[model samples]
Target: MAGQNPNMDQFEAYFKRADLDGDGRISGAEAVGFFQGSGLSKQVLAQIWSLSDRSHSGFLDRQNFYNSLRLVTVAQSKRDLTPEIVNAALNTPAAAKIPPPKINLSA
Candidate 1:
Protein backbone atom coordinates (compact mmCIF):
# COMPACT_ATOMS: atom_id res chain seq x y z
CA MET A 1 0.00 0.00 0.00
CA ALA A 2 3.03 2.24 0.14
CA GLY A 3 2.53 3.13 -3.47
CA GLN A 4 -1.16 3.85 -3.10
CA ASN A 5 -2.51 6.89 -4.94
CA PRO A 6 -3.93 8.62 -1.87
CA ASN A 7 -2.29 9.70 1.34
CA MET A 8 -2.92 11.93 4.39
CA ASP A 9 -3.44 14.96 2.20
CA GLN A 10 -5.93 12.99 0.16
CA PHE A 11 -7.86 11.90 3.22
CA GLU A 12 -7.99 15.45 4.50
CA ALA A 13 -9.24 16.46 1.11
CA TYR A 14 -12.09 14.02 1.60
CA PHE A 15 -13.08 15.77 4.82
CA LYS A 16 -12.88 19.15 3.12
CA ARG A 17 -14.81 17.91 0.13
CA ALA A 18 -17.63 16.86 2.41
CA ASP A 19 -17.80 20.39 3.77
CA LEU A 20 -19.56 21.45 0.61
CA ASP A 21 -21.74 24.27 1.81
CA GLY A 22 -18.58 25.63 3.35
CA ASP A 23 -20.35 26.21 6.63
CA GLY A 24 -17.92 23.83 8.28
CA ARG A 25 -20.56 21.10 8.25
CA ILE A 26 -21.27 18.19 5.95
CA SER A 27 -24.76 17.28 4.86
CA GLY A 28 -25.90 14.09 3.17
CA ALA A 29 -25.36 15.69 -0.21
CA GLU A 30 -21.88 16.73 0.77
CA ALA A 31 -21.22 13.24 2.08
CA VAL A 32 -22.21 11.90 -1.29
CA GLY A 33 -19.83 14.30 -2.96
CA PHE A 34 -17.02 13.25 -0.66
CA PHE A 35 -17.43 9.58 -1.49
CA GLN A 36 -17.92 10.20 -5.15
CA GLY A 37 -14.93 12.52 -5.26
CA SER A 38 -12.92 9.67 -3.81
CA GLY A 39 -13.89 7.62 -6.89
CA LEU A 40 -16.34 5.41 -5.04
CA SER A 41 -19.51 4.34 -6.80
CA LYS A 42 -22.92 5.86 -6.29
CA GLN A 43 -24.13 2.61 -4.74
CA VAL A 44 -21.23 2.68 -2.30
CA LEU A 45 -21.72 6.38 -1.58
CA ALA A 46 -25.39 5.88 -0.83
CA GLN A 47 -24.56 3.05 1.51
CA ILE A 48 -21.96 5.17 3.30
CA TRP A 49 -24.31 8.13 3.67
CA SER A 50 -27.05 5.93 5.02
CA LEU A 51 -24.64 4.51 7.53
CA SER A 52 -23.00 7.80 8.59
CA ASP A 53 -26.18 9.77 9.03
CA ARG A 54 -26.85 9.15 12.67
CA SER A 55 -30.00 10.78 14.17
CA HIS A 56 -31.54 10.48 10.73
CA SER A 57 -30.98 14.21 10.35
CA GLY A 58 -29.94 13.90 6.73
CA PHE A 59 -26.62 15.56 7.58
CA LEU A 60 -23.30 14.77 9.17
CA ASP A 61 -22.31 17.12 12.00
CA ARG A 62 -18.76 17.79 13.20
CA GLN A 63 -18.82 14.85 15.55
CA ASN A 64 -20.24 12.69 12.82
CA PHE A 65 -17.36 13.65 10.57
CA TYR A 66 -14.85 13.06 13.34
CA ASN A 67 -16.41 9.74 14.20
CA SER A 68 -16.24 8.70 10.58
CA LEU A 69 -12.58 9.63 10.57
CA ARG A 70 -12.07 7.69 13.77
CA LEU A 71 -13.67 4.59 12.36
CA VAL A 72 -11.82 4.93 9.09
CA THR A 73 -8.56 5.62 10.82
CA VAL A 74 -9.14 3.25 13.77
CA ALA A 75 -6.54 5.08 15.78
CA GLN A 76 -5.75 3.03 18.88
CA SER A 77 -5.34 6.48 20.35
CA LYS A 78 -5.65 9.93 18.88
CA ARG A 79 -1.88 10.10 18.61
CA ASP A 80 -1.67 6.85 16.71
CA LEU A 81 -2.43 8.43 13.37
CA THR A 82 0.46 8.24 10.93
CA PRO A 83 -0.11 8.58 7.19
CA GLU A 84 0.51 4.88 6.58
CA ILE A 85 -1.34 3.74 9.69
CA VAL A 86 -4.20 6.00 8.77
CA ASN A 87 -4.65 4.24 5.48
CA ALA A 88 -4.20 0.87 7.14
CA ALA A 89 -6.89 1.82 9.64
CA LEU A 90 -9.45 2.54 6.97
CA ASN A 91 -11.68 -0.25 8.18
CA THR A 92 -14.86 1.42 9.31
CA PRO A 93 -17.49 -0.81 10.82
CA ALA A 94 -20.57 -1.41 8.75
CA ALA A 95 -23.64 0.26 10.27
CA ALA A 96 -21.30 1.77 12.88
CA LYS A 97 -23.13 0.89 16.11
CA ILE A 98 -25.77 -1.71 15.45
CA PRO A 99 -29.30 -0.36 15.60
CA PRO A 100 -32.17 -2.25 17.11
CA PRO A 101 -34.00 -4.40 14.63
CA LYS A 102 -37.31 -2.96 13.51
CA ILE A 103 -40.42 -5.00 14.05
CA ASN A 104 -41.84 -3.59 10.86
CA LEU A 105 -39.58 -3.79 7.85
CA SER A 106 -41.74 -1.14 6.25
CA ALA A 107 -41.16 1.29 9.07
Candidate 2:
Protein backbone atom coordinates (compact mmCIF):
# COMPACT_ATOMS: atom_id res chain seq x y z
CA MET A 1 0.00 0.00 0.00
CA ALA A 2 2.27 2.75 -1.21
CA GLY A 3 0.35 5.95 -1.11
CA GLN A 4 1.89 8.76 -3.15
CA ASN A 5 2.37 12.09 -1.52
CA PRO A 6 1.04 15.16 -3.26
CA ASN A 7 4.49 16.68 -3.20
CA MET A 8 5.92 13.57 -4.80
CA ASP A 9 3.47 13.86 -7.67
CA GLN A 10 4.47 17.46 -8.15
CA PHE A 11 8.18 16.72 -8.05
CA GLU A 12 7.62 13.87 -10.47
CA ALA A 13 6.48 16.39 -13.04
CA TYR A 14 9.48 18.58 -12.24
CA PHE A 15 11.84 15.66 -12.75
CA LYS A 16 10.38 14.88 -16.17
CA ARG A 17 11.01 18.41 -17.30
CA ALA A 18 14.52 18.46 -15.90
CA ASP A 19 15.44 15.17 -17.51
CA LEU A 20 15.78 16.74 -20.92
CA ASP A 21 17.91 13.94 -22.26
CA GLY A 22 15.06 11.47 -21.70
CA ASP A 23 17.79 9.34 -20.23
CA GLY A 24 15.72 8.69 -17.13
CA ARG A 25 18.35 10.60 -15.15
CA ILE A 26 19.74 14.11 -14.96
CA SER A 27 23.07 15.85 -14.39
CA GLY A 28 23.69 18.58 -11.84
CA ALA A 29 23.55 21.27 -14.48
CA GLU A 30 20.25 19.97 -15.85
CA ALA A 31 18.83 19.81 -12.36
CA VAL A 32 19.74 23.42 -11.64
CA GLY A 33 18.54 24.50 -15.05
CA PHE A 34 15.02 23.93 -13.80
CA PHE A 35 15.43 27.22 -11.94
CA GLN A 36 17.79 28.94 -14.34
CA GLY A 37 17.52 32.72 -14.90
CA SER A 38 15.35 32.81 -11.77
CA GLY A 39 17.70 31.64 -9.00
CA LEU A 40 20.16 28.97 -7.79
CA SER A 41 23.86 28.29 -8.40
CA LYS A 42 25.89 25.10 -8.35
CA GLN A 43 27.51 26.13 -5.04
CA VAL A 44 24.32 25.94 -2.99
CA LEU A 45 23.06 23.47 -5.52
CA ALA A 46 25.84 21.14 -4.43
CA GLN A 47 24.69 21.19 -0.84
CA ILE A 48 21.14 20.38 -1.82
CA TRP A 49 22.52 17.67 -4.02
CA SER A 50 24.55 16.40 -1.11
CA LEU A 51 21.37 16.39 0.89
CA SER A 52 19.29 14.69 -1.79
CA ASP A 53 21.96 12.56 -3.34
CA ARG A 54 24.36 10.67 -1.15
CA SER A 55 26.01 8.73 -3.97
CA HIS A 56 29.20 9.82 -5.67
CA SER A 57 27.43 9.20 -8.95
CA GLY A 58 26.93 12.23 -11.16
CA PHE A 59 23.36 11.54 -12.25
CA LEU A 60 19.94 11.32 -10.60
CA ASP A 61 17.32 8.79 -11.56
CA ARG A 62 13.58 9.56 -11.27
CA GLN A 63 13.06 8.40 -7.68
CA ASN A 64 16.20 10.13 -6.52
CA PHE A 65 15.17 13.17 -8.50
CA TYR A 66 12.07 13.22 -6.33
CA ASN A 67 14.31 13.58 -3.30
CA SER A 68 16.29 16.41 -4.91
CA LEU A 69 13.21 18.39 -5.88
CA ARG A 70 11.71 17.78 -2.47
CA LEU A 71 14.76 19.15 -0.72
CA VAL A 72 14.66 22.04 -3.15
CA THR A 73 11.22 23.24 -2.14
CA VAL A 74 12.04 22.51 1.47
CA ALA A 75 15.08 24.74 1.10
CA GLN A 76 13.04 27.47 -0.55
CA SER A 77 10.48 27.43 2.24
CA LYS A 78 12.98 27.96 5.08
CA ARG A 79 16.41 26.95 3.86
CA ASP A 80 16.70 23.57 5.49
CA LEU A 81 19.35 21.25 4.00
CA THR A 82 20.19 19.14 7.00
CA PRO A 83 19.47 15.42 7.12
CA GLU A 84 16.49 16.11 9.35
CA ILE A 85 15.08 18.32 6.63
CA VAL A 86 14.84 15.41 4.21
CA ASN A 87 12.27 13.69 6.36
CA ALA A 88 10.77 17.06 7.10
CA ALA A 89 10.07 17.71 3.45
CA LEU A 90 8.86 14.18 3.00
CA ASN A 91 6.21 14.65 5.62
CA THR A 92 5.40 18.18 4.55
CA PRO A 93 2.09 18.43 2.70
CA ALA A 94 2.15 19.26 -0.95
CA ALA A 95 2.09 22.93 -1.60
CA ALA A 96 -0.30 21.95 -4.39
CA LYS A 97 -0.53 25.57 -5.35
CA ILE A 98 3.01 25.41 -6.70
CA PRO A 99 3.19 26.97 -10.11
CA PRO A 100 5.18 24.89 -12.50
CA PRO A 101 8.91 25.46 -12.53
CA LYS A 102 9.63 28.71 -14.32
CA ILE A 103 10.73 27.15 -17.61
CA ASN A 104 9.70 26.27 -21.11
CA LEU A 105 8.13 22.80 -21.06
CA SER A 106 7.97 22.10 -24.76
CA ALA A 107 11.08 21.40 -26.78
Candidate 3:
Protein backbone atom coordinates (compact mmCIF):
# COMPACT_ATOMS: atom_id res chain seq x y z
CA MET A 1 0.00 0.00 0.00
CA ALA A 2 1.13 3.54 -0.60
CA GLY A 3 2.63 5.38 2.33
CA GLN A 4 0.58 8.13 3.90
CA ASN A 5 0.51 11.20 1.64
CA PRO A 6 0.30 14.87 2.51
CA ASN A 7 -2.65 17.12 3.54
CA MET A 8 -3.89 14.50 5.94
CA ASP A 9 -4.55 16.51 9.09
CA GLN A 10 -8.20 16.68 8.13
CA PHE A 11 -8.37 12.93 7.72
CA GLU A 12 -6.59 12.42 11.01
CA ALA A 13 -9.24 14.54 12.67
CA TYR A 14 -11.91 12.50 10.98
CA PHE A 15 -10.28 9.31 12.19
CA LYS A 16 -10.21 10.65 15.71
CA ARG A 17 -13.90 11.49 15.49
CA ALA A 18 -14.78 8.11 14.04
CA ASP A 19 -12.87 6.25 16.72
CA LEU A 20 -15.91 6.51 18.92
CA ASP A 21 -14.79 3.94 21.45
CA GLY A 22 -11.68 5.93 22.29
CA ASP A 23 -9.54 3.14 20.88
CA GLY A 24 -6.65 3.97 18.63
CA ARG A 25 -8.17 1.86 15.87
CA ILE A 26 -11.56 1.82 14.17
CA SER A 27 -13.66 -1.32 13.95
CA GLY A 28 -15.72 -2.31 10.93
CA ALA A 29 -18.92 -1.46 12.72
CA GLU A 30 -17.67 1.97 13.60
CA ALA A 31 -16.68 2.56 10.01
CA VAL A 32 -20.15 1.61 8.80
CA GLY A 33 -21.71 4.01 11.24
CA PHE A 34 -19.25 6.74 10.36
CA PHE A 35 -20.13 6.49 6.68
CA GLN A 36 -23.81 5.80 7.14
CA GLY A 37 -24.99 8.75 5.06
CA SER A 38 -22.10 9.00 2.64
CA GLY A 39 -23.88 7.03 -0.12
CA LEU A 40 -21.24 4.30 -0.53
CA SER A 41 -22.72 0.86 -0.99
CA LYS A 42 -22.15 -1.92 1.50
CA GLN A 43 -20.03 -3.84 -1.00
CA VAL A 44 -17.75 -0.84 -1.51
CA LEU A 45 -17.47 -0.38 2.20
CA ALA A 46 -16.59 -4.03 2.64
CA GLN A 47 -13.94 -3.78 -0.01
CA ILE A 48 -12.39 -0.78 1.70
CA TRP A 49 -12.49 -2.58 5.00
CA SER A 50 -10.79 -5.58 3.52
CA LEU A 51 -8.12 -3.49 1.88
CA SER A 52 -7.46 -1.37 4.89
CA ASP A 53 -7.44 -4.21 7.37
CA ARG A 54 -4.26 -5.68 5.96
CA SER A 55 -3.77 -7.99 8.92
CA HIS A 56 -7.36 -9.19 8.75
CA SER A 57 -7.71 -7.90 12.27
CA GLY A 58 -11.14 -6.42 11.47
CA PHE A 59 -9.94 -2.96 12.35
CA LEU A 60 -7.88 -0.11 10.95
CA ASP A 61 -5.25 2.00 12.66
CA ARG A 62 -4.88 5.67 11.84
CA GLN A 63 -2.45 5.15 8.95
CA ASN A 64 -4.46 2.31 7.46
CA PHE A 65 -7.61 4.37 7.71
CA TYR A 66 -5.95 7.23 5.94
CA ASN A 67 -4.71 4.89 3.24
CA SER A 68 -8.16 3.49 2.79
CA LEU A 69 -9.59 6.99 2.49
CA ARG A 70 -6.96 7.82 -0.13
CA LEU A 71 -7.77 4.70 -2.09
CA VAL A 72 -11.48 5.39 -1.99
CA THR A 73 -10.97 8.99 -3.03
CA VAL A 74 -8.81 7.92 -5.99
CA ALA A 75 -11.33 5.28 -7.00
CA GLN A 76 -14.16 7.81 -6.85
CA SER A 77 -12.10 10.28 -8.89
CA LYS A 78 -11.48 7.68 -11.61
CA ARG A 79 -15.15 6.75 -11.69
CA ASP A 80 -16.04 10.44 -11.96
CA LEU A 81 -13.86 10.78 -15.08
CA THR A 82 -16.02 8.41 -17.12
CA PRO A 83 -18.41 11.19 -18.15
CA GLU A 84 -15.52 13.40 -19.27
CA ILE A 85 -14.07 10.52 -21.24
CA VAL A 86 -17.40 9.90 -22.97
CA ASN A 87 -17.81 13.59 -23.77
CA ALA A 88 -14.34 13.75 -25.29
CA ALA A 89 -15.09 10.74 -27.46
CA LEU A 90 -18.49 12.03 -28.61
CA ASN A 91 -17.94 15.77 -28.96
CA THR A 92 -17.08 17.07 -32.44
CA PRO A 93 -14.41 19.60 -33.52
CA ALA A 94 -11.81 18.53 -30.98
CA ALA A 95 -10.99 22.09 -30.01
CA ALA A 96 -14.58 23.08 -29.19
CA LYS A 97 -15.75 23.27 -25.59
CA ILE A 98 -19.16 22.19 -24.40
CA PRO A 99 -21.46 25.04 -23.47
CA PRO A 100 -22.96 25.24 -20.00
CA PRO A 101 -26.67 24.54 -19.72
CA LYS A 102 -29.06 27.44 -19.13
CA ILE A 103 -31.82 26.93 -16.55
CA ASN A 104 -35.31 28.47 -16.97
CA LEU A 105 -37.03 29.07 -13.65
CA SER A 106 -40.09 31.09 -14.74
CA ALA A 107 -41.93 28.10 -16.19
Candidate 4:
Protein backbone atom coordinates (compact mmCIF):
# COMPACT_ATOMS: atom_id res chain seq x y z
CA MET A 1 0.00 0.00 0.00
CA ALA A 2 2.99 2.26 -0.21
CA GLY A 3 3.18 3.23 -3.85
CA GLN A 4 2.66 6.49 -5.62
CA ASN A 5 3.11 8.10 -8.99
CA PRO A 6 3.95 11.80 -8.92
CA ASN A 7 1.67 12.58 -11.81
CA MET A 8 -1.23 11.16 -9.89
CA ASP A 9 -1.03 13.99 -7.37
CA GLN A 10 -2.25 16.51 -9.88
CA PHE A 11 -5.89 15.59 -9.74
CA GLU A 12 -6.23 14.35 -6.21
CA ALA A 13 -9.38 16.33 -5.68
CA TYR A 14 -10.94 15.22 -8.92
CA PHE A 15 -10.43 11.56 -8.22
CA LYS A 16 -12.47 11.72 -5.06
CA ARG A 17 -15.10 14.03 -6.48
CA ALA A 18 -15.77 11.71 -9.37
CA ASP A 19 -16.01 8.64 -7.20
CA LEU A 20 -19.62 9.18 -6.27
CA ASP A 21 -20.24 5.63 -5.10
CA GLY A 22 -16.96 5.58 -3.15
CA ASP A 23 -15.68 2.52 -4.94
CA GLY A 24 -12.36 4.41 -5.45
CA ARG A 25 -12.69 4.03 -9.21
CA ILE A 26 -14.83 5.72 -11.82
CA SER A 27 -17.44 3.81 -13.73
CA GLY A 28 -18.18 4.66 -17.36
CA ALA A 29 -21.58 5.96 -16.43
CA GLU A 30 -20.13 8.27 -13.80
CA ALA A 31 -17.53 9.60 -16.21
CA VAL A 32 -20.23 10.27 -18.75
CA GLY A 33 -22.31 12.11 -16.20
CA PHE A 34 -19.37 14.27 -15.17
CA PHE A 35 -17.89 14.88 -18.61
CA GLN A 36 -21.17 15.63 -20.29
CA GLY A 37 -20.91 19.21 -19.08
CA SER A 38 -18.06 19.84 -21.47
CA GLY A 39 -19.07 21.04 -24.89
CA LEU A 40 -17.40 18.11 -26.64
CA SER A 41 -19.64 15.70 -28.43
CA LYS A 42 -20.25 12.05 -27.69
CA GLN A 43 -17.60 11.26 -30.32
CA VAL A 44 -14.72 12.83 -28.42
CA LEU A 45 -16.11 11.47 -25.18
CA ALA A 46 -15.95 7.99 -26.63
CA GLN A 47 -12.38 8.59 -27.68
CA ILE A 48 -11.40 9.56 -24.14
CA TRP A 49 -12.95 6.38 -22.87
CA SER A 50 -11.07 4.32 -25.43
CA LEU A 51 -7.73 6.03 -24.88
CA SER A 52 -7.76 6.18 -21.09
CA ASP A 53 -9.31 2.85 -20.33
CA ARG A 54 -5.84 1.40 -20.90
CA SER A 55 -6.55 -1.86 -19.10
CA HIS A 56 -9.70 -2.33 -21.19
CA SER A 57 -11.45 -3.20 -17.96
CA GLY A 58 -14.49 -1.06 -18.69
CA PHE A 59 -13.66 1.35 -15.87
CA LEU A 60 -11.03 3.88 -14.92
CA ASP A 61 -8.98 3.86 -11.80
CA ARG A 62 -7.50 7.10 -10.44
CA GLN A 63 -4.48 7.10 -12.73
CA ASN A 64 -6.51 6.24 -15.76
CA PHE A 65 -9.02 8.92 -14.88
CA TYR A 66 -6.26 11.52 -14.74
CA ASN A 67 -5.14 10.33 -18.13
CA SER A 68 -8.68 10.73 -19.32
CA LEU A 69 -8.74 14.31 -18.07
CA ARG A 70 -5.46 14.99 -19.81
CA LEU A 71 -6.91 13.76 -23.06
CA VAL A 72 -9.87 16.04 -22.52
CA THR A 73 -7.51 18.98 -22.01
CA VAL A 74 -5.89 18.15 -25.33
CA ALA A 75 -9.28 17.83 -26.97
CA GLN A 76 -10.40 21.15 -25.50
CA SER A 77 -7.57 22.71 -27.43
CA LYS A 78 -8.97 21.07 -30.58
CA ARG A 79 -5.88 18.94 -30.99
CA ASP A 80 -6.06 15.56 -32.63
CA LEU A 81 -6.51 12.54 -30.38
CA THR A 82 -3.94 9.81 -30.02
CA PRO A 83 -2.27 7.71 -27.35
CA GLU A 84 0.92 9.67 -27.81
CA ILE A 85 -0.74 12.97 -26.96
CA VAL A 86 -2.71 11.57 -24.07
CA ASN A 87 0.36 9.95 -22.65
CA ALA A 88 2.33 13.06 -23.50
CA ALA A 89 0.37 15.29 -21.13
CA LEU A 90 2.03 14.21 -17.91
CA ASN A 91 5.62 15.09 -18.77
CA THR A 92 4.80 18.54 -20.05
CA PRO A 93 4.01 21.58 -17.96
CA ALA A 94 0.74 21.23 -16.14
CA ALA A 95 -2.35 21.57 -18.26
CA ALA A 96 -4.70 24.50 -17.78
CA LYS A 97 -7.66 24.21 -15.49
CA ILE A 98 -10.45 22.08 -16.80
CA PRO A 99 -13.91 23.54 -16.53
CA PRO A 100 -15.56 22.18 -13.42
CA PRO A 101 -17.78 19.28 -14.26
CA LYS A 102 -21.47 19.92 -13.86
CA ILE A 103 -22.61 18.24 -10.69
CA ASN A 104 -22.97 18.87 -7.02
CA LEU A 105 -20.18 17.79 -4.73
CA SER A 106 -20.48 17.21 -1.02
CA ALA A 107 -17.88 19.39 0.56
Against the hidden true structure, what lDDT does model 4 obtain?
0.67
Backbone clash numbers for all candidates listed: 0, 0, 0, 0
Better of 2 and 3 by TM-score: 2
- Candidate 1 residue-wise lDDT, 16-69, digit = tens: 666877887788777665554434445545654554566678877765664454
Give the deviation of candidate 4 from the true structure as CA RMSD.
5.1
Report the number of backbone clashes for model 1: 0
Q: Candidate 2's residue-wise lDDT over 1-107, tens digit each?
A: 15565555657777877877878887777776764522455555677666556565777877666666666665566464665666665445542333233334442
| TM-scores vs. true structure, each candidate | 0.48, 0.66, 0.61, 0.69
Model 2 steric clash pairs: none
Highest lDDT model number: 4
lDDT of 4 by residue, 12-81 (tens): 6666666768798888887776666555778888888778788998889887887777776677777767
Q: What TM-score does structure 1 among the candidates reach?
A: 0.48
The stretch of ten residues in a row with the least summed lDDT in candidate 2 is: 95-104
Runs of candidate 2 exceeding 4 Å displacement:
1-5, 37-42, 90-107
Best-performing candidate as measured by TM-score: 4
Off by over 4 Å in 4: 1-10, 90-107
Q: Which regions of candidate 3 are displaced past 4 Å? A: 1-6, 78-107
Q: lDDT for every model? A: 0.48, 0.61, 0.54, 0.67
